[PDB]
């Protein structure tokens, strides 16, 4: 379901190896290496992203889920590339926005999402009205939460 070009893979390996100690930069060693989030978050292609902390956690397959291997780094790039299908992009956006990882976007997830975006912070009343507007347009079943199909549907209607 995901795609990579040869150029993307080759350029990604060069960028990933720059994050490694000199002794782990060979092809064989770099493919076994785990880069801590601190080094990943410093990458110019990710440093400005308001969701960078969540992006790292969603793509990590490491034992303590605190680092990225080259394989995780490529998984990340295949989703963020221009080749990724709208269905892949909305599937992973849902995982990134699900701050508690339970399968639905609730009011706290939406408030955390807004706070990531704004960093001038909204008043309690402005946040309440914005969450109410998001839920009115996205929560079809009116259960108070946004599931994956509701989310993919509202994203497919994007202005």
């Amino acid at each position: 379901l995901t795609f990579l070009t040869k150029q993307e893979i080759l350029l990604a390996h060069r960028r990933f190896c720059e994050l490694l100690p000199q002794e782990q930069r060979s092809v064989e060693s770099s493919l076994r290496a785990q880069v801590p989030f601190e080094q990943i978050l410093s990458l110019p292609e990710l440093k400005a992203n308001p969701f960078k902390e969540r992006i790292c956690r969603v793509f990590s397959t490491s034992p303590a889920k605190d680092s990225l291997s080259f394989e995780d780094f490529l998984d990340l790039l295949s989703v963020f590339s221009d080749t990724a299908t709208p269905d892949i992009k909305s599937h992973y956006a849902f995982r990134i926005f699900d701050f508690d990882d339970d399968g639905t976007l609730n009011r706290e997830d939406l408030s955390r999402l807004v706070n990531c975006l704004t960093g001038t912070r909204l008043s309690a009343s402005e946040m309440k009205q914005l969450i109410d507007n998001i839920l009115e347009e996205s929560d079809i079943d009116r259960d108070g939460t946004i599931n994956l199909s509701e989310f993919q549907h509202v994203i497919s209607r994007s202005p």
């Binding site: 990134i96 999402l113 975006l117 914005l130 998001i134 347009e137 996205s138 994203i155 994007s158 202005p159």
Partner: peptide, 15 residues
């Protein structure tokens, strides 16, 4: 404005 919000949220993530 739900739809406008999601456009800005997706653009902040993928743009």
């Amino acid at each position: 404005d739900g739809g406008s919000f999601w456009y800005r949220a997706m653009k902040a993530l993928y743009g």
